[PDB]
Amino acid sequence: GHITFAASPAIALAALPLALASFAREFPDVTVNVRDGMYPAVSPQLRDGTLDFALTAAHKHDIDTDLEAQPLYVSDVVIVGQRQHPMANATRLAELQECRWAFSSAPRGPGAIIRNAFARYGLPEPKLGLVCESFLALPGVVAHSDLLTTMPRTLYERNAFKDQLCSIPLQDALPNPTIYVLRRHDLPVTPAAAGLIRWIQHHAL
Numbered sequence: 001g002h003i004t005f006a007a008s009p010a011i012a013l014a015a016l017p018l019a020l021a022s023f024a025r026e027f028p029d030v031t032v033n034v035r036d037g038m039y040p041a042v043s044p045q046l047r048d049g050t051l052d053f054a055l056t057a058a059h060k061h062d063i064d065t066d067l068e069a070q071p072l073y074v075s076d077v078v079i080v081g082q083r084q085h086p087m088a089n090a091t092r093l094a095e096l097q098e099c100r101w102a103f104s105s106a107p108r109g110p111g112a113i114i115r116n117a118f119a120r121y122g123l124p125e126p127k128l129g130l131v132c133e134s135f136l137a138l139p140g141v142v143a144h145s146d147l148l149t150t151m152p153r154t155l156y157e158r159n160a161f162k163d164q165l166c167s168i169p170l171q172d173a174l175p176n177p178t179i180y181v182l183r184r185h186d187l188p189v190t191p192a193a194a195g196l197i198r199w200i201q202h203h204a205l
Contacts, residue, residue: 001030003193006037006045006054007200008179009135010075010154015204022203023196030192039107039182043067046182052193055200057177058107068185072201074176076153077113079168082143093121093172100129102149104138107177113150116175139165150174 007016012034020032037045039058045051047066055072063069079096081088087096097118103111110131118126129147132138139159142149148168156167181197183189 001192002033003030003190003196004033004035004050004052005193005196006035006042006051006056008038008056008075008152009036010152011055011179011200011204012036013154013158015200018203019196019199022199026195026199027192030196032196038105039063039180042182046184049184052187053181053183053197055179055181055197056107058180058182060178062107063180063182066184066186067182070181070183070197072179072181073204074178077150077174077176078153078156079114079148079170079174080139080142080151080156080165081148081168082146083164083166085146085148085166085168087148087168088166090168091171093117093123093170096126096148096168097123098127099148100127100146102129102138102142102145102147103131104149104151105133105135113175113177117172120175121172 037054039056042051042054043064046054087099090096101111101114106112110133114126132141135155138149138151139161143161143164
């Protein structure tokens, strides 16, 4: 009667608090253990049963065979800088090509989202200003610098420095990651876990 799971920052900030409230009404007897986790770091923990499931970005084709992937949603990735950044009003990635970036976490390694974005539009590599694996730390770091970064729209909307940040109004396309429910496919689902996932799905809409 316990559920142990990991959640992405976007989910942890909006869907999760509402989902745990609704879930606790329906299953008042189940104790939840929630933690951060991103793929591929969660993979060993999913494999060995220490996590029941992880809600995380990943890429369909790049997930260990042991795991199934129920896609929930495509995240909304935004580019974020300090509010009066010289590139605040930029609409094309080429206009950003000389900025320094805070490379943020992603399944394929820090900055993978912006590097992939720059690559797909025929640009050279984005310039590395620093690596910030902590989504907790990221908004305050960017607010106190002229670094740009990428983050989930949910983090951009819900962080303690929101009054000191902007989102770049891009007309170019960012490779949005798909958020999955990741879990051993040989693990039957309990109605408790399944219901918690439905609630998270419901409130992330």
